[PDB]
Amino acid sequence: PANLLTSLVRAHLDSGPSTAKLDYSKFQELVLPKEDAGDVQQFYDLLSGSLEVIRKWAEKIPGFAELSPADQDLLLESAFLELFILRLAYRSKPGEGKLIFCSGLVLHRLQCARGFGDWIDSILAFSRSLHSLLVDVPAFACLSALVLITDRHGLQEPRRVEELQNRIASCLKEHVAAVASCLSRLLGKLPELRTLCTQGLQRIFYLKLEDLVPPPPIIDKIFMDTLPF
Known part of the structure; x- marks a missing residue:
């Protein structure tokens, strides 16, 4: 309620790193000298590291594991990109150009630029916007979950999803x-996040075109399943 709020906060905090488990050993703000294979592999590796984390997080949202298994999968798949962006934006520190990933890895914006392209700047813009509204942890823990638990085409039980939402x-x-x-200001972030999910699909398309490094199967599936055509 209640305990729902508590369960939500707890799931959120267990799905990220402790301030103590931040890893700066690879962080470099200075880069010497377009995409090469090393950049593309890291882009996919960063994406891939969120999916087990976001799946274990979702399982702890009360009610989620009692949606049908096919609706669990559809919701996770459809929201992955959005959840990756939102949690990254919240986690990161755009005033310093610092991206903090869910493993605790810290990278600088320009260590990521090559792999992500413009998207990482747009993510950083969203992050500074999100930070301006000073969303506290409990509010974020709800918002996060609402990104996951939302209507999607192909749900078996759309009303049960609507109830949990x-x-x-x-x-x-x-x-x-x-x-x-300041609530509808909050909820005003969700449509923007959708737009950011699109930029992400545009980047994966371009890289699949480029085809230096192939995407890993499960990222590829999410891409293919989320193209509405």
Whole structure:
């Protein structure tokens, strides 16, 4: 409620690194000298490292594991990119151009530019926007989940998904009160995140075109399954 809020916060905090487990051993703000294979492999590796994490996170959202297994998979697949972006934007420090990934790895914007292309700048723009509204951890823990638990084409039980969504929206609304002016400002971030998911699909397309390094099968599936055509 309640305990829902608590369960949500706990799932969120368990899915990321501790401030103590941040890894700076590879961080370099200075880069010497377009995409090569090393950049493309790291792009896919960073994407890949979120998917087991985001899957273990979702399993801990109360109600999620009692959606049908096919609806679990569809929701995870459809939201992966958005969740990767949102959690990265929240985690990172755009004032310093610092990306912090869910493994604890810290990289500088220009260590990532080659692999990600312009998308990483747009992610950084979203991150500074997200930071300006100072979303506290409980609110974020709800928002995150609402990105996952939302209508998608092909759901077997769209109403049960809608029920769990309303439960989470309800939980969020209250928390914001306990602390929809600044709520609808919050929810205003979700459409922008969609637009960022698109830029991500555009980047994967370009790299599949380029074909230096192939995408790993499960990223490829997400790409193929999320093309609505």
